[PDB]
Amino acid sequence: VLLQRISPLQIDPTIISNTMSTVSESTTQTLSPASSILGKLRPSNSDFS
Amino acid sequence: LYDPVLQKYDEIPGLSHNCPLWCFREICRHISGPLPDRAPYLYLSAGVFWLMSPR
Amino acid sequence: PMSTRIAEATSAIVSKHPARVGLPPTASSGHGYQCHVCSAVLFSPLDLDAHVASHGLHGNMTLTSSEIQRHITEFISSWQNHPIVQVSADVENRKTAQ
Amino acid sequence: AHVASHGLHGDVENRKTAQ
Amino acid sequence: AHVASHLTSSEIQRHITEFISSWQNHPIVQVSADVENRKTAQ
Amino acid sequence: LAGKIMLQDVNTVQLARVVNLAVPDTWMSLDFDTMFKHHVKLLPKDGRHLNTDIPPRMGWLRAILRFLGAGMAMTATGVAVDIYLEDIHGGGRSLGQRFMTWMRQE
Amino acid sequence: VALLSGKYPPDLVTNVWYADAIYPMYADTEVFSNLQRDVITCEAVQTLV
Ligand SMILES: [Zn+2]
Ligand SMILES: [Zn+2]
Structure with missing residues (x-):
């Protein structure tokens, strides 16, 4: 928390989602690698303590 | 009332201020007069029933 | 009279103070002084309410007053961001008319 | 939260630890 | 526990659940049964 | 015209007729066409969720989901808001089967 | 995800940022009082033996 008071960066999870929304898949397919990335990483949580 | 977006009370004046309810009330009172029944018609x-006031 | 009331309505819809200043950003002078889930700072009301909303889980999203006010602030921010209304004027100023 | 929006939009181990 | 009680396409989840419900209470998975008190099969 | 209507893509507003929807007369003063073409879209910003796919056959569900998302935009107070398509819990398969099941008896 | 996502404030200057951030934790003066405790700890173990 003493480092959170000081550190200049701010972790925003929107970067990885806004760059993985760029993928070009064919949708006639059960397997979704980009959605596997998103549902696996789960960027949308807080608390990177 | 309270506007949720503007976050303030509206200044629509209250019911005690308006002219037409006052004129409505006074014309109904003067048309009734000594009668116990108070509506003008x-x-x-099918058709309306009147009030037997001479005015 | 009416013009006072409509002017107050304009100032309510257009001014949440997101107004831009020219300074180095400092850890003290931030708009998000104490964000009320985790006490961080993000320097802007749009990112501050995005911070308040993102900690809530996205199946529990219910419309409320703050949820309306976020879209209000984003809307007014993009409208003030547009340049033709950045530099505009309705009336003269004794120099342009001259 | 509804109120805040109105203003926003307008033991040995524990003793060793403390030591 | 509720969220864990809650990937692939909907037909595939239907096939997986039908397969597991078919092999659910089959007597190949079950363990720890009892003696029968036979008194036949001499 | 029958061989035509078997094949061509119908406009968004016209596909209310399979499901008996209608644009309300309160939306006659406002624009709707640009909101249908550009501000209620499928395939959301998080990517695919597999409750987002629709087969190339029976693609009229896209046009009815247009009405659905735009109604969801317009019922809310405040500005009209860009809305993307979250999960549908049945799939395009189950939605098409239930829609055909109701369209068995009108 | 914290390694894949991280950004700065949009137009920042680092000397101003750290010159604001480091100031109260040096206005604090707790660090000088622990040295006297270190003195009496060493004096106590020596006089014990
Ligand atoms: Zn917070
Ligand atoms: Zn309240």
């Missing part, structure tokens, strides 16, 4: 669906 009664609206049945």
